[PDB]
Amino acid sequence: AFTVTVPKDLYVVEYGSNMTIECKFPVEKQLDLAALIVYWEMEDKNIIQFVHGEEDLKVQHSSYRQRARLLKDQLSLGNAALQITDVKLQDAGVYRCMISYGGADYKRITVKVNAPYAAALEHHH
Amino acid sequence: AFTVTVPKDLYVVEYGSNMTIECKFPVEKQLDLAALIVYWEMEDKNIIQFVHGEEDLKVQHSSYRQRARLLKDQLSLGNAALQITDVKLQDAGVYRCMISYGGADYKRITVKVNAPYAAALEHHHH
Amino acid sequence: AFTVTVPKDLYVVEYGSNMTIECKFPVEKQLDLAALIVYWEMEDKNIIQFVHGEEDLKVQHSSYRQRARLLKDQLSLGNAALQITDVKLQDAGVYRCMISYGGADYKRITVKVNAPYAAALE
Amino acid sequence: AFTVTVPKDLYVVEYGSNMTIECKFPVEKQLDLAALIVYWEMEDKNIIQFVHGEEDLKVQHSSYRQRARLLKDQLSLGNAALQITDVKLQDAGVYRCMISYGGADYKRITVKVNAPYAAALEHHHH
Amino acid sequence: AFTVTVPKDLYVVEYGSNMTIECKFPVEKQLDLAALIVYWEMEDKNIIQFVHGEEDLKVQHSSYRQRARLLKDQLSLGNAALQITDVKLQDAGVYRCMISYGGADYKRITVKVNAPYAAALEHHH
Amino acid sequence: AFTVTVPKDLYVVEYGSNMTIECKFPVEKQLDLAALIVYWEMEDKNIIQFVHGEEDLKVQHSSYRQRARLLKDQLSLGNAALQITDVKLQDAGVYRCMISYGGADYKRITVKVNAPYAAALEHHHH
Amino acid sequence: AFTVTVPKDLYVVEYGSNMTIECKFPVEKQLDLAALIVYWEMEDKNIIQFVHGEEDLKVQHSSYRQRARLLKDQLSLGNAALQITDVKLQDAGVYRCMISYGGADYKRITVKVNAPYAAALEHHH
Amino acid sequence: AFTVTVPKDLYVVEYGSNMTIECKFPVEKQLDLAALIVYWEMEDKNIIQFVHGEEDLKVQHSSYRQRARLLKDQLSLGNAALQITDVKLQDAGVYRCMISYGGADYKRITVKVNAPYAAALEHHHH
Ligand SMILES: Cc1c(-c2ccccc2)cccc1N1C(=O)c2cc(CN[C@H](C(=O)O)[C@H](C)O)c(OCc3cccc(C#N)c3)cc2C1=O
Ligand SMILES: Cc1c(-c2ccccc2)cccc1N1C(=O)c2cc(CN[C@H](C(=O)O)[C@H](C)O)c(OCc3cccc(C#N)c3)cc2C1=O
Ligand SMILES: Cc1c(-c2ccccc2)cccc1N1C(=O)c2cc(CN[C@H](C(=O)O)[C@H](C)O)c(OCc3cccc(C#N)c3)cc2C1=O
Ligand SMILES: Cc1c(-c2ccccc2)cccc1N1C(=O)c2cc(CN[C@H](C(=O)O)[C@H](C)O)c(OCc3cccc(C#N)c3)cc2C1=O
């Protein structure tokens, strides 16, 4: 039974810092990159799409361009690691990772963002 | 006795990714920011200088301008966490973290960088 | 604004000599010897660990037994004195002094070694 | 007869510490992992599900993730030791260790957690 | 993957009547009694301890002697069926079946009992 | 008569695995952390020095940092257990555990490491 | 912090002479002999087990019987001084002194043995 | 009702190999060395005589010099294991293990030794 698991389903990240959130999927024997699909989204905004060889920036929401990378070396180990760079308050919420590799599954991760008064103030209006 | 520890003295980072390397120092009860000095460098190039309550960028090497920050929320938990954004091959090397909090200590961490042939090529020629 | 100062950035010594390299930190009025830490290092082999009251050889490297000693009463000067007796050719390299006294700082000191042909055979 | 024995059926742990609780089971000569099953439970919440050779974590209750661990090294010594890091007041209660190794058996252990007023106030709010 | 199944997670019986809870486990073709262990308990009260062929009854709780049986006829059908005679009010609660047959797994069956006023008052006092 | 016991004076471990070796000493009712000293060494290279309540981290030999820890949880039970993670070929030899707890005693444990050819070649040449 | 020190971690004695190796332990006030444990050994061979104010010679190795002494006078000054009489070539090697006095620590002392050709010849054969 | 039990009443070993033959006896909770007696023999040739603390080999047959040892490590486990190193053809025959521990009992174990033509030839001629 193909099951994606998450070591953490909650992350607490500092405003402006970098973030790595992980989804584990089973990789027995060598990895077949052609049969792997990884989809990373947050509340209906597409962050990352990995079909066949490389990502696809066709659906990547503008709030994530140049800011989101999928750690490719980690796929061989069974790790779909999403990195977001320079975390902002609008990065708090529910992330979903969909993984297709033989079987198909997905998991949910919650990111809370702590921010100082100045940043919160700019985000308030 | 004051000793900085490292949960990992070796990091293998993929070219172009973000990196977080940690140094632990003992904090009991609530952290005293006024007594805390945190210093990160690599091969005699200063990355971070955290004195009193804020980073000091007077000595920061040009390869770390807006590329390196210390996670301050982790300081309360006794964790001096250095974050390097967009790791390049020039970032592979030996990092030293100097912590002063009552006592004083430092530790070493090795960072290796794996890279595709394109990036390795541009670094090799330049 | 705590800062460590080095009088000479480079020391040139001949083989079998006695080299005294030295960093100096701002000591004002009485020296609170309890709040002083002095590391002396050379390319990640540590030479001195002056913590609290006296030295600590529990981490000292093999290349400095009985050879190196930090002049102690020198610390009322602010003097954090390292002297290598019977200087060897492998003592040439980059030295570092860490000083923690209120603030903290460290400085580098390049040390080159001249030797005759008899010793150079490693 | 196959029989699990517990040297302590009661542990008094301090909030925030680590506890390792033991379940002894008879192992003759060298252990055979394929025949060994270890369930660790607490009021019908699964902590550990150790079948074949490694754990099973899609059964693991949420309040125990990255906190609980079966000490594998000591299984060959007839000990099924569970370690809970950073004990919280929710960790109080009756733990069960089910062990299948040819025979089958299970024993109960009681954990009581002491906490200062501050932490007990935090837990009391939730 | 050995896993105990349950047809009815819930049983609703009436006081004085008789109860038949069943925990199914996978058997195929011949049943090897010399490798079968069934354990029925309810809230740390042991009911039956079926170990290698026959139940041990110095293990049985006092409130279950002469009233609880396992159907050794039904074990060949992949069925650990516990039956309670004259269901009193103290027979309500969560039951557990532990089963070791090659693998090992357990499951829980909750039981609610209905009683008239008289029996309810005898239980209350 | 204060006696340290070792349930195994010989371990045969596989290169790359984890190893936990046990020393037992008598603790009747509560443990007196203030009166407990625990040394772990392996052929004149110190591994653990547990004095008062915490490990001493500068006595420790370089080849064992990041890889050796004393499992404090089990001290209450009278078990000075040493875990070495990611066992190396150099970890083979005679371990000694010294214990002071009222009385004092020490015992010896022989560790042998099996390894496949690749690791044995690395250790043979370096 | 209890700590045993050694004035000399190396002795070079002479085959046939008398040897005295010392281990310093910090003694405050007058010596409380009830809490002092001195354990001199050499390559897993017990030499002196000074406990409770006396020497314990039963586990003492045969080769050190009536040749090994502990200068009790030095104990009051903070000195554990093991003396060996008539040094043979077997006495070369590493000695360990273990001292428990409030705290506990141990030190190592290396003994080298010079010897004429006759002694070396009988030892070699 | 004291009773010695043999897991294997028959052993088939190779020449020059090592063999261990076991005899189980009930050790309840903890072993009393002062009330334990273990005889091992083969064809009325005395092999091991374990009385009180450890073996005393006065009546040791001259054919079991250097050969046999009693696994004491296993005595506290209710196991009297005779270990014979360097199995020779002289060792085939019936072994008896005789245990006194409260009660007493003995058991018989047959040992057959396989051997190549060379060793069988030297045994046949002498
Ligand atoms: C030594 C130390 C310790 C420490 C102290 C004792 C023992 C072990 C560790 C603990 C925490 C922080 C630091 N800890 C500092 O607190 C610090 C501060 C500065 C800035 N010092 C200024 C300066 O003068 O540059 C001064 C304000 O004036 C450093 O800069 C190193 C540097 C920079 C440029 C050239 C050279 C050389 N050669 C060396 C290096 C360091 C540094 O490790
Ligand atoms: C664990 C298990 C499993 C199983 C094993 C691993 C994973 C999933 C399921 C499967 C079938 C049967 C059993 N399976 C047993 O085969 C068994 C056997 C005994 C009897 N063993 C005797 C004894 O313990 O009295 C004897 C001393 O050995 C039990 O006794 C429960 C009991 C009785 C009294 C106090 C306490 C406590 N605390 C616990 C409990 C159990 C029990 O679940
Ligand atoms: C450990 C220690 C310390 C010490 C404690 C913690 C840290 C640093 C030092 C200080 C003073 C004395 C000792 N300190 C002892 O107080 C002692 C006592 C005995 C006798 N203990 C009995 C026995 O062994 O018969 C036992 C009660 O039964 C020893 O015997 C060593 C020995 C003998 C035979 C086999 C093996 C092995 N493997 C080891 C060795 C020692 C020994 O260093
Ligand atoms: C071993 C021993 C020794 C002895 C022990 C150690 C060293 C040297 C001598 C001394 C005196 C008597 C015995 N010494 C026993 O003390 C004993 C006790 C029993 C048990 N007695 C039962 C009872 O009445 O409780 C009886 C069954 O009824 C035996 O029979 C056990 C038995 C049963 C079935 C098959 C075989 C075989 N083959 C053997 C045989 C024996 C037997 O030599």
Curated annotation (Swiss-Prot), chains B, D, F, H:
Ubiquitinated; STUB1 likely mediates polyubiquitination of PD-L1/CD274 triggering its degradation. Ubiquitinated by MARCHF8; leading to degradation. Deubiquitinated by USP22; leading to stabilization. Residues 2-110 form the Ig-like V-type domain. It is found in: Cell membrane; Early endosome membrane; Recycling endosome membrane; Nucleus. Induction: Up-regulated on T- and B-cells, dendritic cells, keratinocytes and monocytes after LPS and IFNG activation. Up-regulated in B-cells activated by surface Ig cross-linking. Disulfide bonds join C23-C97. It comes from the Eukaryota. Highly expressed in the heart, skeletal muscle, placenta and lung. Weakly expressed in the thymus, spleen, kidney and liver. Expressed on activated T- and B-cells, dendritic cells, keratinocytes and monocytes. Glycans are attached at N18. It is linked to Truncation of the 3'-untranslated (3'-UTR) region of CD274 transcripts leads to elevated expression of CD274 in multiple cancers including T-cell leukemia, diffuse large B-cell lymphoma and stomach adenocarcinoma. Disruption of 3'-UTR region is caused by structural variants that stabilize CD274 transcripts, leading to overexpression. Increased expression in tumors promotes immune evasion and tumor cell growth by allowing malignant cells to escape destruction by the immune system. Interacts with PDCD1. Interacts (via transmembrane domain) with CMTM4 and CMTM6. Interacts with (phosphorylated) STAT3; promoting nuclear translocation. Interacts with CD80. Belongs to the immunoglobulin superfamily. BTN/MOG family. Plays a critical role in induction and maintenance of immune tolerance to self. As a ligand for the inhibitory receptor PDCD1/PD-1, modulates the activation threshold of T-cells and limits T-cell effector response. Through a yet unknown activating receptor, may costimulate T-cell subsets that predominantly produce interleukin-10 (IL10). Can also act as a transcription coactivator: in response to hypoxia, translocates into the nucleus via its interaction with phosphorylated STAT3 and promotes transcription of GSDMC, leading to pyroptosis. This is Programmed cell death 1 ligand 1. It comes from Homo sapiens. The chain holds residues 18 to 134 of 290 of the full protein.
